[PDB]
Amino acid sequence: MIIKGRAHKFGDDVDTDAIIPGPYLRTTDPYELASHCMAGIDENFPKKVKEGDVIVAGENFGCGSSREQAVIAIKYCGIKAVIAKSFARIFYRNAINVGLIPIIANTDEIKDGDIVEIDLDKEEIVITNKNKTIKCETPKGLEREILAAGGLVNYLKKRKLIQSKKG
């Protein structure tokens, strides 16, 4: 599949608090969380982002705390993927489990406002307004399957469903 949208570029070490400040963690509504996505470093993000857009960052994106809210804040902004040079281990796992696609690439090649086209099958990112394409690395194995199902929950109910018609 192909994910195409506007890129919102950030730097290195964008941690969970920058993604979704601790004080907002006192809410249930995921959309409530989404309304403050990236508010830690860019108070204008929630008002600029559009469904289908992509967050682009530097090294160690999602750094810090084991917050499922961080990935939920991103996912509920209508963002299907995050492109970064590297991802904090815990964030990566949480992203996979909620259906948020973590993509690895040299983000120095991407500028804020660029229109990017991520082709998950070819594992390339076309930066349409810059007439260039860069390679990327998408999730594989189990993580790819969980992502394909849209998250851990779906993956598990599809596993049960199969077992259902098994007898």
Give the containing element (helix H, strand E) for 13: none
List beta partners, residue 134: 125
- Contact map string, positions 8 to 37, toward Zn ion, x by CB under 5 A: -----x-x----------------------
Selected from 3, 19, 34, 55, the binder of a copy of itself by CB under 8 A is 3
Selected from 109, 117, 124, 143, the binder of a copy of itself by CB under 8 A is 117
Which range binds Zn ion by CB under 5 A, 57-65, 79-87, 93-101, 125-133?
Answer: 57-65
Strands annotated E in 59-152: 81-84, 101-104, 115-119, 124-127, 132-135
63 binds Zn ion (CB under 5 A): yes
13/117 with CB nearer a copy of itself: 117
- Contact map string, positions 40 to 79, toward a copy of itself, x by CB under 8 A: ----------xxxx------------------------x-
Strands annotated E in 21-166: 54-57, 81-84, 101-104, 115-119, 124-127, 132-135
The letter for the amino acid at 124 is E
Closest CA to 61 of 130, 12, 126, 128: 12
Angstrom distance (rounded) from CA 19 to CA 136: 23
Q: Which of Zn ion, a copy of itself, none sits in contact with 162, Cβ below 5 to 8 A by type?
A: none
In the complex, the residues that contact a copy of itself under the rule CB under 8 A are 1-5, 31-32, 50-53, 78, 117, 148, 150, 154, 157-158, 161
